[PDB]
Design a protein around this ligand. Structure first.
Ligand code: CLR
Ligand code: CLR
Ligand code: CLR
Ligand code: LJX
Ligand code: OLC
Ligand code: OLC
Ligand code: OLC
Ligand code: OLA
Ligand code: OLA
Ligand code: OLA
Ligand code: OLA
Ligand code: OLA
Ligand code: OLA
Ligand code: OLA
Ligand code: OLA
Ligand code: OLA
Ligand code: OLA
Ligand code: OLA
Ligand code: OLA
Ligand code: OLA
Ligand code: OLA
Ligand code: OLA
Length: 393
């Protein structure tokens, strides 16, 4: 069948993908620019991500279309249009790796997060990572290429000029770079680091929610113990434990009542302890019952406001992990095909239709991030609606 027929489907699909990558990711950047609530360090790596996805539809996809033709070109010039998408894919990994780290710092040390993780530093890291993306993505241009052994039978068959080659990806980029350097070192290892960072985010979250439920139990159980105690020493024991678990939880209009609610609580425990150390066992049990009023007015509201925040931090970590995981679902096929081309020379090269299919799959990854934000993030969804209603409609 004529090559232009199959090539037309691939090109139409690529262009259709390009439009969707530019539209959806320009919509993300427009939301982060307008909504002040969306302006945080975590969302500055999202804009770096969206920028990389914008450049895929504007440059990487046009470049991919160009190299599918095998047009005659200067080898190093063809080497650039073959390696530019590696820069964009490398930038996406750095951002994906920074979001995972930023979400870990947020849940592992929320108190020193505002000073440690600032916007000006996020900008310096984004700039640093973008430069390194060009260094890593264009390494073949520094010498690790196949321009020293061009297929001159292929170049002559296509009427190429002196110093030109038939611009094909696997003919100018060595496969040991794509497998050992790009896939294993620069794509796989970083994705494994993310997997481990997300394992520690969720581990730190399950632990903290449980430890807050342990204090909530240690208080009420010690209150029940006092309501059934018999002497002043028992009461003094159940209060010594409660004071430890109270100050332990202490560690805005809401933070003012949160600090007042614990002053009352810890103070009321001091009230009962003095009586327990004075031999008054009845007056101590009565003073401890006033904690039941502080509990149903301050403590139970704090426990639930802290439980909700930990849940909101887990929801966001999951949303971030769905973005890095879908990056693997889209890029692993094309990487796994390169491994078969590289590791098994006795295997038939994957057919051209599977290459196209794997190539367009890697490009659909630049369309899906705006959908995860709109689906899994309430603030992004609302801001997308505002832009669509006010400007696009
Ligand atoms: C700011 C952005 C939009 C500029 C984009 C410039 C791009 C399209 C330019 C920059 C370098 C250019 C390449 C450099 C060298 C060659 C070798 C020549 O034998 C074939 C064209 C080719 C392969 C060029 C194609 C177009 C190219 C990739
Ligand atoms: C969710 C993702 C990671 C699963 C996708 C795995 C895909 C890319 C794997 C599964 C089976 C693989 C194929 C199995 C057999 C062959 C025949 C061989 O002569 C060329 C490679 C080729 C054609 C493989 C290419 C890659 C392949 C299609
Ligand atoms: C941990 C996961 C997500 C990373 C991906 C695993 C990759 C590296 C694995 C999965 C399947 C593997 C391939 C399975 C079969 C073959 C055929 C063999 O003759 C050469 C090695 C080769 C080509 C393997 C290379 C490595 C491979 C591509
Ligand atoms: C098969 C169609 C003919 C032209 C081609 C090709 C081709 N063959 C590959 N073996 C290949 N491997 C990659 C990868 C880059 C980063 C990770 S995997 N690419 C790039 O990904 C989209 C393609 O258009 C190209 O830009 C590849 N292209
Ligand atoms: C390539 C296009 C990428 C365009 C990137 C422009 C980003 C503008 C943006 O969203 O800025 C975020 C905002 O400034 C956060 O404070
Ligand atoms: C993930 C979602 C990808 C987008 C949806 C379908 C891709 C349709 C295939 C696009 C690539 C072209 C493959 C093809 O049909 O062309 C092979 C041709 O026959 C060889 O000569
Ligand atoms: C295709 C079914 C319709 C749904 C569309 C989505 C699925 C597209 C997936 C693969 C298309 C490529 C199929 C494989 C084409 C192989 C061509 C072939 O058999 O080789 C030519 C042979 O040399 C001469 O007979
Ligand atoms: C959308 C329109 C794209 C349709 C044309 C793209 C395929 C043509 C490729 C070719 O000219 O060989
Ligand atoms: C990804 C696909 C979603 C497409 C985005 C549609 C909204 C366009 C935003 C705009 O043009 O202002
Ligand atoms: C390349 C040209 C397209 C990039 C446009 C992205 C900017 C969109 C919103 C920024 C605020
Ligand atoms: C090719 C190189 C393209 C580089 C991409 C540049 C745009 C991408 C991300 C910009 C992120 C903006 C975040 C601003 C943080 C600084 C701040 O406002 O405090
Ligand atoms: C708006 C920013 C995006 C600009 C992209 C411009 C659209 C170009 C799309 C595909 C270009 C592919 C050209 C193929 C080159 C080979 C042609 C030939 O061999 O004669
Ligand atoms: C922005 C520009 C994106 C569109 C152009 C993309 C890649 C450059 C196309 C180069 C095609 C060269 C074909 C002519 C030839 O060398 O014979
Ligand atoms: C967008 C601007 C330019 C993209 C179109 C590139 C087409 C170059 C093909 C040259 C040729 O026909 O030989
Ligand atoms: C805004 C920054 C502008 C710089 C953009 C980079 C443009 C040049 C990119 C790659 C240079 C490769 C072209 C060299 C021709 C190939 C030489 C050869 O094969 O003999
Ligand atoms: C590091 C961030 C800025 C990088 C922007 C991209 C500029 C181009 C980078 C490398 C170009 C190397 C290829 C130069 C062509 C040389 C051709 C030859 O030697 O025959
Ligand atoms: C900064 C790191 C590298 C910049 C220099 C790379 C230029 C490569 C020239 C291409 C060639 O080998 O002829
Ligand atoms: C072959 C050299 C290319 C440079 C490597 C590119 C891939 C980056 C992989 C790991 C970088 C590690 C530093 C980034 C932060 C993650 C560290 C961590 O696990 O906490
Ligand atoms: C290679 C494996 C890719 C790992 C996926 C990245 C982030 C999701 C981790 C899930 C916990
Ligand atoms: C950051 C760590 C990155 C990679 C190491 C993989 C193991 C980390 C997850 C296990 C630790 C845990 O779940 O508590
Ligand atoms: C290795 C990574 C492969 C698959 C991980 C996919 C993560 C889940 C993405 C879809 C969730 C909606
Ligand atoms: C995550 C980590 C994934 C593991 C990566 C697998 C590494 C190497 C597997 C490929 C080995 C193939 C060697 C066979 C070559 C031959 O004998 O022809």
């Amino acid at each position: 069948a004529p090559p232009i027929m199959g090539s037309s489907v691939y090109i139409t699909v690529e262009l259709a993908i390009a439009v969707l990558a530019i539209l959806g990711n320009v919509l993300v950047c427009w939301a982060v620019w307008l909504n002040s609530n969306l302006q945080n360090v975590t969302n500055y790596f999202v804009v770096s991500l969206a920028a990389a996805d914008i450049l895929v539809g504007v440059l990487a996809i046009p470049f991919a279309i160009t190299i599918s033709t095998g047009f005659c070109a200067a080898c190093h010039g063809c080497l650039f249009i073959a390696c530019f998408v590696l820069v964009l894919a490398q930038s996406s990994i750095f951002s994906l790796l920074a979001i995972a780290i930023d979400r870990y710092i947020a849940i592992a040390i929320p108190l020193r997060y505002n000073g440690l993780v600032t916007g000006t530093r996020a900008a310096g890291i984004i700039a640093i990572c973008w430069v390194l993306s060009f260094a890593i993505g264009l390494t073949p241009m520094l010498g690790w290429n196949n321009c020293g052994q061009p297929k001159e039978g292929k170049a002559h068959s296509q009427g190429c000029g002196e110093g030109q080659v038939a611009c094909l990806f696997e003919d100018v980029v060595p496969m040991n770079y794509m497998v050992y350097f790009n896939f294993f070192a620069c794509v796989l290892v970083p994705l494994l680091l993310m997997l481990g960072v997300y394992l520690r985010i969720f581990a730190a979250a399950r632990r903290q929610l449980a430890d807050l439920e342990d204090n909530w139990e240690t208080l009420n159980d010690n209150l029940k113990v006092i309501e059934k105690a018999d002497n002043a020493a028992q009461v003094k024991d159940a209060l010594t434990k409660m004071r430890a678990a109270a100050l332990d939880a202490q560690k805005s209009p809401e933070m003012k009542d949160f600090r007042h609610g614990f002053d009352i609580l810890v103070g009321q425990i001091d009230d009962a302890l003095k009586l327990a150390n004075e031999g008054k066992v009845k007056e101590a049990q009565a003073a401890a019952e006033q904690l039941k009023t502080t509990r149903n007015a301050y403590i139970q509201k704090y426990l639930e406001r802290a439980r909700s925040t930990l849940q909101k931090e887990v929801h966001a970590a999951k949303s971030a992990a769905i973005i890095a995981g879908l990056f693997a679902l889209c890029w692993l096929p094309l990487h796994i095909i390169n491994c078969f081309t590289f590791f098994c020379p006795d295997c038939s090269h994957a057919p051209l239709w599977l290459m196209y299919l794997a190539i367009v799959l890697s490009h659909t990854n630049s369309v899906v991030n705006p959908f995860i934000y709109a689906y899994r993030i309430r603030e992004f969804r609302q801001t997308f609606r505002k832009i669509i209603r006010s400007h696009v409609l």
